[PDB]
Design a protein around this ligand. Sequence first.
Ligand SMILES: CN1c2c(O)nc(N)nc2NC[C@@H]1CNc1ccc(C(=O)N[C@@H](CCC(=O)O)C(=O)O)cc1
Length: 407
Amino acid sequence: DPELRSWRHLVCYLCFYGFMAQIRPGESFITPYLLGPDKNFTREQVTNEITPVLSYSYLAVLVPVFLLTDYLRYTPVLLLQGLSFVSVWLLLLLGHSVAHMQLMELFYSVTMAARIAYSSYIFSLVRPARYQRVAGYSRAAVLLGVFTSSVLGQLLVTVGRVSFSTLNYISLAFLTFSVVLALFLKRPKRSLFFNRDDSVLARMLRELGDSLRRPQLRLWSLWWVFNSAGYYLVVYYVHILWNEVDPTTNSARVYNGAADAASTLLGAITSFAAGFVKIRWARWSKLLIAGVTATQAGLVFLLAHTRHPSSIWLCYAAFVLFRGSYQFLVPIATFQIASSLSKELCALVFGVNTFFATIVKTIITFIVSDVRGLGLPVRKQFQLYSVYFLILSIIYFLGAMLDGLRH
Ligand SMILES: CN1c2c(O)nc(N)nc2NC[C@@H]1CNc1ccc(C(=O)N[C@@H](CCC(=O)O)C(=O)O)cc1
């Protein structure tokens, strides 16, 4: 056992690493960079040969990372997420082939699988009497870092007048700094599943079928599997659609970072406003899902049918409201699933729901989006995503009536 770190030097460093690990100013401007005059990629190569590999590689690495997150005690995977972000921005700046960007999506899928490597790091690092204050400060440092990277990426592009290549070298400097900050993180001695000194598995399975027959876990897991698979299929491809609506030559008029900083600012407001709604609106739960999914059905339809370049701000508003609609139902889903679950059980169910949502996301993106399937453009596949939410909101509205008139 090593020497214990100072407490104020620990929380001010977890909230500084969790702030600096989100600083990727050129993250919202990857698609205007790939579809720009610096990359030599067709519009049909980005939406049908590169971006479906993001959902393929996410399915392949979600279970290896989630096991390696708990086996390696959450410090090498926070380093793997930092080194895969450098490998994304090294393949952005030095990659020219389509296979160089399919590899880039492979490295970005490692970082998306390691998004829980920081939320579960401070869970095992901090004692439970001190955890909810540190998890409040950390989460408010993550969503401040996600906000201020899109603001810094927008101010460098619009006000600063830098190119997308220069912005990705600025983003590469903020990402090598996040690798150095991940080296000085205190590794925990025991983990939640594998490193525990002790069975854990036996207990889990035995305490699962009791919790599997809960009408709120079984309802919101089906939301997490299907209504979140269609969510991320919009977020992957909305930057390809914004490059089609307003195909500007000047990089300073792109405003992808202002539309992803506002969706983070609205995503933090609706997630805060959901915390006073998790319990008192849990009875009218299928009607809340069917009301938001039908709202997401109209916003994705509004994205797919705005064709004039002057209505690019309507496409920016129909995605800030789309991310605000989804991030409203995430604290309600996180509460109603993990209410009567253990911490080992809630880590399993949220990992299984994210895995099953990645199977649905892979099945749709192979049929609808991939060139080996249909090979649809981003407008004709956003019309299929619009009727995907409309099919889902009708199923939840029938469930809010065929289980709502039985009283
Ligand atoms: C970088 N960006 C991108 C892009 O713009 N264009 C292509 N072709 N490929 C890619 N690769 C990945 C990424 C677009 N795909 C994603 C994938 C995942 C997220 C994501 O984790 N969103 C989180 C919020 C975290 C955040 O704000 O980044 C959410 O819960 O909605 C957001 C966008």
